[PDB]
Amino acid sequence: DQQKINKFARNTSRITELKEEIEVKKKQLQNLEDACDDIMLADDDCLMIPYQ
Amino acid sequence: GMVFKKETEGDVTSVKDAKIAVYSCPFDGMITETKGTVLIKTAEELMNFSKGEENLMDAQVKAIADTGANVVVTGGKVADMALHYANKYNIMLVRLNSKWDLR
């Protein structure tokens, strides 16, 4: 019985869970960023700008 | 009277008039290998399973001592954690038995 491969199995699974968390936060980053640029381009301050 | 070649483990029975408990495999012995994902993620639950295993076989020799039987027959192997409570309880143990010994 080996406790170092018990650490080795935990180590590789922690590699997998971190990289997936980066990808979902990058897509949320571009989603808000491209939501900024589209609404500025159409109809700036004329009378009022409603915001949800 | 009945002759058993198997080596007597622990001390002798508390009484010769003892109730004879004949069991197919009450005591076990632990070894394992690589799992579905190889060699499980921690060793803490290995320690957590090992603590209840000793208190399980502590109560197994205790409940035999409570119910009146002062000798246990193990067709399976002997556990170490089962053994050192069986010496204090003065119950005689058989380390292993075959198919003909129990019947």
Residue B14 DSSP label: S
The answer to whether the beta carbons of residues A4 and B43 sit under 8 Å apart is no
The answer to whether the beta carbons of residues B58 and B8 sit under 8 Å apart is no
Tokens 């002759």 locate to B3
Q: Which of residues 5-44 of B touch A (CB under 8 A)?
A: 31-32, 37-43
Cα-based distances in Å from B85 to A46, B40, B59, B91: 88, 31, 9, 9
Q: Which residues in chain B have Cβ-Cβ distances shorter than 8 Å to A1?
A: 31-32
Pair of tokens at residue A35: 């939501």
Q: How was this structure determined?
A: cryo-EM
Distance, CA of B50 to chain centre = 15
The answer to whether the beta carbons of residues B45 and B71 sit under 8 Å apart is no
Greatest alpha-carbon span in chain A:
74
- Min Cα–Cα distance to chain A from B33, Å: 7
The 3-state secondary structure of A10-52 reads HHHHHHHHHHHHHHHHHHHHHHHHHHHHHHHHCCCCCCCCCCC
CB pairs under 8 A between A and B: 21
Element (H, E) at B9: strand B8-9
Give the strand pairing for B69-74 and B92-94.
Answer: parallel
CB contact under 8 A, B31 and A6: no
Length reported for chain B: 103
Q: Which residues in chain B have Cβ-Cβ distances shorter than 8 Å to A8?
A: 39
Pair of tokens at residue B35: 């799992």
The 3-state secondary structure of B17-79 reads CCEEEEECCCCCCCCCCCCCCCCCCCCHHHHHHHHHHHHHHHHHHHHHHHHCEEEEEECCCCC
Chain B residue with minimum CA distance to A9? B41
Rg (CA), chain A: 22
Pair of tokens at residue A25: 């936060």
Q: Which residues in chain A have Cβ-Cβ distances shorter than 8 Å to B43?
A: 3, 6
- Min Cα–Cα distance to chain B from A10, Å: 5
Please tell me the distance from the alpha carbon of residue A51 to that of residue B62, in angstroms, as a whole number: 73
Please tell me the distance from the alpha carbon of residue B70 to that of residue B12, in angstroms, as a whole number: 9
